[PDB]
Structures are given as C-alpha cells and as structure tokens.
Design a binder for this molecule. Structure first.
Ligand SMILES: S=C(S)N1CCOCC1
Ligand SMILES: [Zn+2]
Length: 257
C-alpha cells in the first residue's frame, strides 16, 4: 500500500495513481516574485464560530480532526471561491527535522509543517462526490515554523498519546479551529490536487502567506506518533509530506501586493 517510505513513497505513487503525473498536481513551489497580484480576488471569509469537532483519528499517514459537516457550521467562502465550502477535517504534514515538513514551499523554503483545513463544495452534497469535481474542495494551507508555542494547538498535542497508532481514535469535541489561524488572511491561490493518493485534481488551494509559530515541544509530540498499528514494529510518523510537483500550465495568484 502507498506510504512515505523508500519502497512505497511519492516516487512510487504514479504506478497505482497515474494522475500523479497529471496537469494540476500539488503541492508546488510558490515563487513569490512570479505570483501575480489579482486585485479582483475577494477577501477570504472563514466562518468557524459554530464549528463542531467530533473526533481525532490516526489513519496511518496523519491524524485527522473531524467535524460535523452535515450542516453549514464551519464554512469557507469568498477569495477565489464561488459558493460555500464546508469544513470536514484538518490534518498536518510534518518533518523529522525542523528544516523540512511542509508540502508547499515558498521560494524553495521548507517549513517545519503544514496544516490543511479541508472543505468541500456544498453544491455536490457530500465529500465523496465533491472529490470527483474540478471545483470540489477548497483546502486552506497554513505553514508552521518552530518558535513560540501556539496555544490553540495544545489541545491537539495533548490527545496524541491516546491515538499513537494506526486506527486509533478519540473523542475530540469542542475544539475551536480559529485558534490555529494566523493574524493575516493574505493568501496565494492556484488549482491543484490532493497531496496524498488518490491525488485527485479537485482542489482550489488557498495558502496563507503568514505562518503560525509552534514550539519545538509541540512538533516533537507530532513526531512521536506511529504509522504502524499497535503490536507492529514501531515506525515513527515523520516526513509524511509530498515534495513540490511541476507547476505546468498554471499561474499562482496573490491576494496581496
Ligand atoms: S488536503 C489532503 S492532503 N487530503 C484531503 C482529505 O483526504 C486526504 C487528503
Ligand atoms: Zn494534506
């Protein structure tokens, strides 16, 4: 099965998922000098006040914090988007070392980790239908750098001991994802894909310019998770990122000058 090891990692995925070599794959390098300011791009609208988190799951490649997406409780609108996209889950990608871990890069710079807040277009009714559409998902990407702690992240860090291994889940109600956002909502946007198999080309990427800072202790706790199931040899869950893919026939747009 696919993963992030030498024998099943990103260089292998194309054999099961040929779209890996497609025309709108993610992540990409964001060349800040070549991105074009688009004065027509609207401000982003992030409406998370009514968010209802439910559960946190180690799925063997990351951990997902899952939300009730059966009503418009936490939605993303505006920016490059037409219509309303509902938050279904967030997860991260991170490194074994602070100098790597993000999937997008900025002028080839790698951050320690990258948060993905995953939303689906409500005109398609459910997530499984949305991922089959070119405008099915909107993923809000946020870079993490190591420095001061992010207080709003700590409740996530503290439950990780209870979902160490693949397939473990825990109740995770009343978590407020607003605590994960930076001050600025300035962003870059481009059309792309899921960064894990099935690599579907269904995502409008919105990547925030401003990283959040997390502490060394917070990211160290991410690195104590396991890719393996309980009772299997321990494989630390680190370096669960796909490297930058060719931009091909795409232009990255900026919401800011
Ligand atoms: S944003 C990305 S990396 N995800 C979305 C949800 O399903 C797995 C892949
Ligand atoms: Zn992701």
């Amino acid at each position: 099965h696919w993963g992030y090891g030498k024998h099943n990692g990103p260089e292998h995925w194309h054999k099961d998922f040929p779209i890996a070599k497609g025309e709108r794959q993610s992540p990409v390098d964001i060349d800040t000098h070549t991105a074009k300011y688009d004065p027509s791009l609207k401000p982003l609208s992030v409406s998370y006040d009514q968010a209802t988190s439910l559960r946190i799951l180690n799925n063997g490649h990351a951990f997902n914090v899952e939300f009730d997406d059966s009503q418009d409780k936490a939605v993303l609108k505006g920016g490059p988007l037409d219509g309303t996209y509902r938050l279904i889950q967030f997860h991260f990608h991170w490194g074994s070392l602070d100098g790597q871990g993000s999937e997008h890069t900025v002028d080839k710079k790698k951050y320690a980790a990258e948060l993905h807040l995953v939303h689906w277009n409500t005109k398609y009714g459910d997530f499984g239908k949305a991922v089959q559409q070119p405008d099915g998902l909107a993923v809000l990407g946020i870079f993490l750098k190591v420095g001061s702690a992010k207080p709003g992240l700590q409740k996530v860090v503290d439950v990780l001991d209870s979902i160490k291994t693949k397939g473990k889940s825990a109740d995770f109600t009343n978590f407020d994802p607003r605590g994960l956002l930076p001050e600025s909502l300035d962003y870059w946007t481009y059309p792309g894909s899921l960064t894990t198999p099935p690599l579907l080309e269904c995502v409008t990427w919105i990547v925030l310019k401003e990283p959040i800072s997390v502490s060394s202790e917070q990211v160290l706790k991410f690195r104590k998770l396991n890719f393996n199931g309980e009772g299997e040899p321990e494989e630390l869950m680190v370096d669960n990122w796909r490297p930058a893919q060719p931009l091909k026939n795409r232009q990255i747009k900026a919401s800011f000058k």
